[PDB]
Structure 1
Amino acid sequence: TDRVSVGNLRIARVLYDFVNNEALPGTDIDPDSFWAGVDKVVADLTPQNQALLNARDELQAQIDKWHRRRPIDMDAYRQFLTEIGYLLPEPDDFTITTSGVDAEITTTAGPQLVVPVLNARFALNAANARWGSLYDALYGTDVIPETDGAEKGPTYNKVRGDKVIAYARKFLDDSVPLSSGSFGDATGFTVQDGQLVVALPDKSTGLANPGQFAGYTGAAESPTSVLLINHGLHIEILIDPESQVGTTDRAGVKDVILESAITTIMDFEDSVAAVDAADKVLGYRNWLGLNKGDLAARVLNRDRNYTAPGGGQFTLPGRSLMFVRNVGHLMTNDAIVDTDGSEVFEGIMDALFTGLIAIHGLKASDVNGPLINSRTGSIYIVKPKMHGPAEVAFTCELFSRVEDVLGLPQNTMKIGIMDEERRTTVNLKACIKAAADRVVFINTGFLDRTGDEIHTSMEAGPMVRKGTMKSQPWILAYEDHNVDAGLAAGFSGRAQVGKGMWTMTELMADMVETKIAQPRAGASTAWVPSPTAATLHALHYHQVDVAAVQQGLAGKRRATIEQLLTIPLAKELAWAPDEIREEVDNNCQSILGYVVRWVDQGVGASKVPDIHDVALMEDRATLRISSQLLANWLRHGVITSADVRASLERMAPLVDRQNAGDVAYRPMAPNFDDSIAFLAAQELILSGAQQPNGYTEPILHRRRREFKARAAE
């Protein structure tokens, strides 16, 4: 084979070479020591990693049997969950003690981007998306309707531009109010005595609250830009009377720039396809470039310089503070195998390598690269798919052991707890407590959590449709319970409380209209799928004072355990055959749509047309929910495997047409049984009920390396 033997490890050569020649130099960690560290950590933590995975199966096996042996009695259901150790007791009240955390996280509320780390240009754009032009965001999207001669065309539409300008002016009025008059009638800006002064046609005024003036560039008598702050977020008015847009503008204004994506999550998990050592190195290679601060295709933006209202120079971050999202506890990867040939656990590998690489982001020099990520010295790892408090404790112990190998102070590696499995939801307080000195983030989502919901209660009966799930009692309790737990553990001012991703990348008007609900619910952050979306979602943090919302929610217990445990069973004869048919086709094409690009092209995140040609950018969770739903309906006789195959066959050509604009694409229809993508989609459904916690990675990872194998002959 082509591996390097170290202790019990057989490291893939490409990985070994990458760590030694690219990752290690500059960290002052001795190579041989590092690799012995890896051998040690892997040997020491693998058994516990395995025991936890076995605990999941044992619990699920018990719940399965419980449902088979029986209108649910909730007292008995609950007592049973307590008996098997699924429902643990709730700890007393406490406050997290996590320290050395950047201000982006402790204090600032705002958008958070997620991006596939394997895609360097996407990753590049995300990092630079800390600052984004509101004009570009408004003009380029449907937030401004195209109706009244404001349509987009191959050239700039001045009528549309004026609407953009008016929209921005009104934003300024709502966010940084003048003590009298509107920004719409502004004629110019001057800095007079460390104060911003705004010229109107008939007078001059300052800010209703002068403290919102945070700086400027250029001469104080005629600034090239004015920097403003609201709710901890910065607004920059660019002033340039001789630019084209400036010439038409009443105050010479050229653009309004918003501090947008305050933090970004570089993703190694559900948005990327990485099934082997070659894929993993590409991943780690981009993350290195980002932390070194030298990755380019167009560079990483440098920090922005301003003149304080007083008179000195200061510097504001120009990049989005980066987190990394490791894979979770389940999967193994062939990047490392042991002597007998067993693949090493992928999450353990991610903590070591993504942690090692992140050392470079803690300082600027020749050997570490020019740009700094964390200014406080933290490495931020989001850890997905944890089930309960013991799996959290294990993560902390892993990070603790990784810190020792890497020579870092204890608690350097912070953890972001994704709350997307049921056993975490109902034990959330205990999960946070288990990370009380490392936690900087909790969040919620729809697709994975609902996937787990369906899998856990697979045997209980047919579940409601996917669309119906969004409004079920359990999920509403789950959303509120998340925020409550976080606030009760002292998160406001200390850690992020996040909500889920907006997936409809083209429906920006809808996003601006409805996504405001998340800050209003007290989320200090929420996920956006693009830099444009980050900019538009930032408007919400200007309209909503999240700090104040979180304060008003304090001490409230809005979710009962009974609500959390309400299984989304369908009622009697809830559906007409056309409705069943609609739902089946829907899920079949969401699986096909996502799966063809995963297996054939190693893409896990992209604008995928849904059954009604709406463009969604979902991650791999879309497979979990969809497949678990179909498997649930199969198992209870709502549908048949014939219906499923016939649906998949009906939807395959449609997916084929929706990818016409693509060169690399290879149709699935009409030779279905020779498409590895098509067979994967079909396996995901017919084998769905048998997968551990309904996870799709085992089948998906296998099919992708099958496709890659066929490519190699």
Structure 2
Amino acid sequence: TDRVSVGNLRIARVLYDFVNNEALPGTDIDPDSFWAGVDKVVADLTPQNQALLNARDELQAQIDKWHRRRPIDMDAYRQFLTEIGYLLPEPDDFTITTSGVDAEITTTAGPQLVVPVLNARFALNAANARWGSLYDALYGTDVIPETDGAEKGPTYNKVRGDKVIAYARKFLDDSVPLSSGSFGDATGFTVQDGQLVVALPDKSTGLANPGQFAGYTGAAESPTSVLLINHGLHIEILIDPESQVGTTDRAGVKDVILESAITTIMDFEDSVAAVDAADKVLGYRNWLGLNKGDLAARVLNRDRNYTAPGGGQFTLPGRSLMFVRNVGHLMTNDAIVDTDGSEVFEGIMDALFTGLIAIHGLKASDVGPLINSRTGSIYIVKPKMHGPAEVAFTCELFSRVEDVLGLPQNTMKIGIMDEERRTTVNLKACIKAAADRVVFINTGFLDRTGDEIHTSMEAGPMVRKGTMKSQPWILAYEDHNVDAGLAAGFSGRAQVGKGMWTMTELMADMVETKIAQPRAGASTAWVPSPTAATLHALHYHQVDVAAVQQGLAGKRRATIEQLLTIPLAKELAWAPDEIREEVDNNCQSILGYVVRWVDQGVGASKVPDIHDVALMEDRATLRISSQLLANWLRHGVITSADVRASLERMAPLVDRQNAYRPMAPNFDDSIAFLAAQELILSGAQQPNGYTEPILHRRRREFKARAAE
């Protein structure tokens, strides 16, 4: 049909054509030595991949047994885990040796953006979100309360605009402070002899710390803009009295631009639905556009030029340093199949194909104008790993792709996600396994909750979904992550990252609460939009991360006993109503996500919950919900009759909460509905509670039954 024959591999034509005509040219790599390398690498590495997945299952079953066979004694649970190799011994202290890393990762602290790579429009904006308007972000979201007078209507509201402006002025004061006065009384900006002087109504002043003055545009007397700096992040004041917002401003300021999303993660994993070669080629084509510099729908902003505080003409990068998030070790994709017809490990494929593609990010001009890494590294996030032997295996896999691609060893750097229990209680061993390729560690708290629930499925009922964020195990897990990174010398070398803020409409809540992440010494945290990146940039001007990290070293705040504390609910924990509610809540979350996945191949979007509070979540949330319900089922809390009633109930609301095809009132005809049912009912049987097998299968079912 459409398969090409390369050795033991039968590649899909769409993939074979794309790689040949689009990816390879300019890579200075013979289009034949490559595919041989694909064939070799697949053949040689497929064993160990399959052996590691078997290890997971073997381990999972011993744990299922120990709980079935009955209290809960911590010291016993701990000895058992050690006995089974689950809980490996902790290595001697060390320091990572990664090099060739850009400043956005080794040094800068600031928000990290995650965008689905199959959406070029999102992917463009995310790349362009290195710089963002603070007026926009304040005006458009509820950071400035829509009280009275300040309501946000079809036209621009001057009262609301004044409210934004005051917010930004107060921000300026608390970031680049004046030696005397306050930006809110300022009337003009000039640069005179390399210093910056702010025209106050009664006098003039400079910055308290004059070094925070980074540059400017336009003539030094009537500057177009003035560039500030705090905590290694740039602030830009756009000056134009001629403008709309300009005339109303006491110093004629049009805007304040913040350096926001310092890095972005282009995603092939949980934020996309890609079940075939057709799907993977789209994301591949976009990642290529991104690496060349020519992705268009609206284009990638080019770099920003400035005048240094004297006369020199420097430049700043206009884009976010891009990572790519490959899929993990579990799934296979039929984009490539062997002679017997077995599907090829998608993880190995992603390494070969995202690595190849990223070579363009390394070179400018002719067959792309734009450069990702200034230092010659390729940044890859590797999710869903369980233990140091799976980290090691990812090293080796990268070592081999490099050989195939002809890059120096250690080019491809790894972004380690701490989002599986077996990784968590062995994190030091995971970092040691990747000591010379590791550019971050990051707490993937949602997936981590999923694994947490599935690992102890046979122990008893779990606490509700909302109760998880406050649990002893997850607070220990968050801190433990930071101690290990800092111990291994991440400060000034690698990022130390935290999770995603899914409540996309609740920005005031984000601005008030997300500050805790850098306060815990994390040099980066995840946001789901360019706007939330700008707002989360504020926290880094408020919190000196370098120092928090500095005064956290040497400390150990988690014990293994705290990590291993299973989030079990106590006896008589819940009234009948709180259960019905939690059931309805998970069924609506599962329904509204799965329906967009199977029917439209959307892996991440703005989906309203039960109360229409819009949440932008991905498969990790689904993994939590479906595993939670599955767990309550397994342990008596609810029945099978209950699940169906809830699904049946929530379905028509999801339909009304949404091109779209309604699941109600015809339930066993919607493949999506049958998927959401399967996810819950087959939940305990899924390997590690993983949601992709069912999802992939059911999406492919939808694709087929729609061709005619």
TM-score, normalised via structure 2 length: 1.00
Secondary structure in structure 2 of the residue aligned to 1:443 = strand
Deviation at 1:76, TM superposition (A): 1.4
Deviations 1:485-513 (A, max 9, x none): 11111001111111100101111111111
Deviation at 1:71, TM superposition (A): 1.0
Deviations 1:604-660 (A, max 9, x none): 11110101110000011111111111111111111111100111001101111100x
Pairing 1:259–2:259 present: yes
Secondary structure in structure 2 of the residue aligned to 1:711 = coil
- Name which of structure 1's ranges 82-91 and 245-254 shifts more when overlaid on structure 2: 245-254
Pairing 1:479–2:478 present: yes
Secondary structure in structure 2 of the residue aligned to 1:95 = coil
Deviation at 1:692, TM superposition (A): 0.3
Deviations 1:304-352 (A, max 9, x none): 0000002110110000110000000000001110111000000000000
In 2, the alpha carbon distance for the partners of 1:569 and 1:83 equals: 23
Deviations 1:572-615 (A, max 9, x none): 11011111111111111110010000000000111101011100
Structure 2 partner of 1:573? 572
Deviations 1:452-500 (A, max 9, x none): 0010001111111111111111111000000111111100111111110
- Name which of structure 1's ranges 465-474 and 345-354 shifts more when overlaid on structure 2: 465-474
Deviation at 1:157, TM superposition (A): 0.8
Deviations 1:489-540 (A, max 9, x none): 1001111111100101111111111111111111100011100100000000
Deviations 1:147-176 (A, max 9, x none): 131111111111111111111111000000
Deviations 1:75-109 (A, max 9, x none): 11111111110000000110001000000000000
In 1, the alpha carbon distance for the partners of 2:633 and 2:148 equals: 50
In 2, the alpha carbon distance for the partners of 1:470 and 1:187 equals: 47
Secondary structure in structure 2 of the residue aligned to 1:238 = strand
Deviations 1:36-92 (A, max 9, x none): 000000001000000000000000011111111111111111111111100000001
Deviation at 1:569, TM superposition (A): 1.1
Structure 2 partner of 1:101? 101
Deviation at 1:301, TM superposition (A): 0.3
Deviation at 1:384, TM superposition (A): 0.4
In 2, the alpha carbon distance for the partners of 1:551 and 1:326 equals: 32
- Name which of structure 1's ranges 481-490 and 243-252 shifts more when overlaid on structure 2: 243-252
Secondary structure in structure 2 of the residue aligned to 1:678 = helix
Secondary structure in structure 2 of the residue aligned to 1:190 = strand
Deviations 1:212-264 (A, max 9, x none): 00000011112110000000000000111111211111111111000000000
TM-score, normalised via structure 1 length: 0.99
Secondary structure in structure 1 of the residue aligned to 2:149 = coil
Deviation at 1:446, TM superposition (A): 2.6
In 1, the alpha carbon distance for the partners of 2:31 and 2:385 equals: 31
Deviation at 1:145, TM superposition (A): 1.1
Structure 1 partner of 2:505? 506
Pairing 1:705–2:700 present: yes
Deviation at 1:427, TM superposition (A): 0.2
Deviations 1:367-426 (A, max 9, x none): 1x1111111011000000000000000000000000000000000000001000000000
Secondary structure in structure 1 of the residue aligned to 2:369 = coil
In 2, the alpha carbon distance for the partners of 1:445 and 1:582 equals: 26
Secondary structure in structure 2 of the residue aligned to 1:511 = helix
- Name which of structure 1's ranges 437-446 and 588-597 shifts more when overlaid on structure 2: 437-446
Deviation at 1:192, TM superposition (A): 1.0
Deviations 1:662-701 (A, max 9, x none): xx11110111010000000000000000000000100000
In 2, the alpha carbon distance for the partners of 1:694 and 1:669 equals: 27
In 1, the alpha carbon distance for the partners of 2:300 and 2:478 equals: 36
In 2, the alpha carbon distance for the partners of 1:283 and 1:705 equals: 17
In 2, the alpha carbon distance for the partners of 1:569 and 1:243 equals: 59
Deviations 1:249-286 (A, max 9, x none): 11111110000000000000000000000000001000
In 2, the alpha carbon distance for the partners of 1:460 and 1:508 equals: 38
Structure 1 partner of 2:241? 241
Secondary structure in structure 1 of the residue aligned to 2:504 = coil
In 2, the alpha carbon distance for the partners of 1:657 and 1:256 equals: 40
In 1, the alpha carbon distance for the partners of 2:666 and 2:224 equals: 62
Deviation at 1:445, TM superposition (A): 2.9
Secondary structure in structure 2 of the residue aligned to 1:467 = coil
In 2, the alpha carbon distance for the partners of 1:699 and 1:211 equals: 56
In 2, the alpha carbon distance for the partners of 1:121 and 1:152 equals: 26
- What 5-or-longer segments of structure 2 have no aligned partner? none
Structure 2 partner of 1:164? 164
In 2, the alpha carbon distance for the partners of 1:9 and 1:290 equals: 28
Secondary structure in structure 1 of the residue aligned to 2:678 = helix
In 2, the alpha carbon distance for the partners of 1:674 and 1:148 equals: 48
